Amino acid sequence: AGKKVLIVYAHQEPKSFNGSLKNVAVDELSRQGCTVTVSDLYAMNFEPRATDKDITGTLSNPEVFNYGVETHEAYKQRSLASDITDEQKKVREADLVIFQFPLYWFSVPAILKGWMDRVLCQGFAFDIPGFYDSGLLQGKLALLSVTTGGTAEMYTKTGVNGDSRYFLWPLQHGTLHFCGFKVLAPQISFAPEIASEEERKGMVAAWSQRLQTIWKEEPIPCTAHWHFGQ
Amino acid sequence: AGKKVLIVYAHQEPKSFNGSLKNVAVDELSRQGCTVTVSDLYAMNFEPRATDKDITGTLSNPEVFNYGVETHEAYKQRSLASDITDEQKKVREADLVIFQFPLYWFSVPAILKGWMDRVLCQGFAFDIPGFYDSGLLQGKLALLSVTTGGTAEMYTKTGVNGDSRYFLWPLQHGTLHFCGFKVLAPQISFAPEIASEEERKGMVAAWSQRLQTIWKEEPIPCTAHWHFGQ
Ligand SMILES: Cc1cc2nc3c(=O)[nH]c(=O)nc-3n(C[C@H](O)[C@H](O)[C@H](O)COP(=O)(O)OP(=O)(O)OC[C@H]3O[C@@H](n4cnc5c(N)ncnc54)[C@H](O)[C@@H]3O)c2cc1C
Ligand SMILES: Cc1cc2nc3c(=O)[nH]c(=O)nc-3n(C[C@H](O)[C@H](O)[C@H](O)COP(=O)(O)OP(=O)(O)OC[C@H]3O[C@@H](n4cnc5c(N)ncnc54)[C@H](O)[C@@H]3O)c2cc1C
Ligand SMILES: COc1ccc2[nH]c(I)c(CCNC(C)=O)c2c1
Ligand SMILES: COc1ccc2[nH]c(I)c(CCNC(C)=O)c2c1
Ligand SMILES: [Zn+2]
Ligand SMILES: [Zn+2]
DSSP: OOOEEEEEEOOSOTTSHHHHHHHHHHHHHHHTTOEEEEEEHHHHTOOOOOOGGGBOSOOSOOSSOOHHHHHHHHHHTTOBOHHHHHHHHHHHHOSEEEEEEEOBTTBOOHHHHHHHHHHSOBTTTBOSSOOGGGOTTTTOEEEEEEEOSSOTTTSSTTSTTOOGGGGGHHHIIIIIITTTOEEOOOEEEOOTTTSOHHHHHHHHHHHHHHHTTGGGOOOOOOSHHHHHOO | OOOEEEEEEOOSOTTSHHHHHHHHHHHHHHHTTOEEEEEEHHHHTOOOOOOGGGBOSSOSOTTSOOHHHHHHHHHHTTOBOHHHHHHHHHHHHOSEEEEEEEOBTTBOOHHHHHHHHHHSOBTTTBOSSOOGGGOTTTTOEEEEEEEOSSOGGGGSTTSSSOOTHHHHHHHIIIIIGGGTOEEOOOEEEOOTTTSOHHHHHHHHHHHHHHHHHGGGOOOOOOSHHHHHOO
């Protein structure tokens, strides 16, 4: 209600399963009266590489280029590439940011990692000091919606891949929390390519039905215990 | 044959700390008689986006695009883009692969994440099934050479970032071990920017002497327990 939602989407095919979890998310939040924005990275042809072209202006120190130092500088001078500035503008408005993506090597597809590297710069998403609980994006909610080729069986402490929670750490704690987001419980749709229709349709339902009360939720305790047990 | 090394370098500045760890690696390994090859992803302007342009010719179903599927086939009928081909040939010949990069959001810079997303495709680095111990790259050695913004204490069970082994999981286990690599303990250089000329030169020396006995080091027991403790 009145809330603004940002969905950063990372999938090349609209007909894909990720596409349906995304459309589902879009229809429901909208149907509820929420303002919804979507960043379909692939269709934007989003630049994922961190380069000096990200700072249009003149560098304070061109002798030894430090992307970290320069983008912090550029942000204060409003001289970051317009594509990054557009995204930061969306994040800044959002009350809720959803990441929709297929797991790639236990992480986010590279194009989305680029979005994280280029969009969450110092001065914008966090300050030193002013990170973790005093991150600059405090007051906002973040949620990861991950689809996997592997199965729930495969993703357990006594399974090959280890409990799926282990690979959420760099993203949930290292990124979102570091920036002040309150982290909601992740949506993990396991092995959709494998499951039958009466499963790929049950997962979606779960996503949809879950989105129906999303504003009802409380963040998770983004700790090592939560992620790795003991 | 014996001792071929591939270094995947992921930094934009040649005069950066990252640049030196890489130069000393190249020199020290070459001096011991090793065959060294470097992949400066930034100078190559490496493409990290997982798209249709990764396949030369006409898709095996452009109607509904699925990256995994499509590349496995392109790989089988030898039709992958020339850049993915070049890297794969480089990997195929190496006995040891080193990843030299600064830590970005507890992971690798998007550009290096793309390399993995696109170079380690089904059919080349692993198969379904055919992974971890039965991965197609079984028998090679991998090492992660990482630099951080955070200081040593920050990366402990009591620090705000938690033990560094936590973010190593996705890279070391979910990627390398999964492709069948044998993983040597990671080389981590803490906060080279905050350190002093004196201190940085000390970390560079460390990396160097280590490269001298790197061939006699035993791989780590890359297990869920190694990374997360008891
Ligand atoms: C580079 C790379 C690395 C990877 N690394 C990992 C990894 O580390 N771990 C892991 O577990 N997996 C990994 N994967 C696999 C990946 O996570 C899965 O392939 C992906 O999650 C599948 O989701 P999708 O959105 O592509 O679905 P799809 O491939 O589209 O499959 C879903 C099926 O359901 C159909 N469908 C679409 N919409 C609906 C709907 N509304 N209702 C029902 N069915 C629908 C589709 O047409 C399709 O046939 C990797 C893949 C790649 C390319
Ligand atoms: C998008 C982004 C996200 C990040 N996320 C994280 C994160 O999650 N966690 C984290 O801890 N950090 C993070 N960082 C920080 C980043 O990891 C560090 O900035 C990086 O590791 C520093 O390495 P460098 O090679 O850039 O060093 P440099 O900035 O190049 O510093 C080394 C300096 O030492 C000088 N020097 C002196 N002696 C030598 C010598 N012998 N040879 C060469 N150089 C020497 C160099 O010339 C140089 O000026 C992030 C930064 C960015 C940009
Ligand atoms: C369960 O752990 C992993 C780890 C790395 C992986 N890389 C790929 I590619 C897959 C799934 C393959 N399916 C498709 C459509 O490509 C995968 C699964
Ligand atoms: C510890 O987690 C992160 C996460 C994202 C980050 N982006 C930058 I630039 C830094 C370096 C900030 N300096 C110090 C001493 O932390 C950084 C550190
Ligand atoms: Zn946390
Ligand atoms: Zn392992």
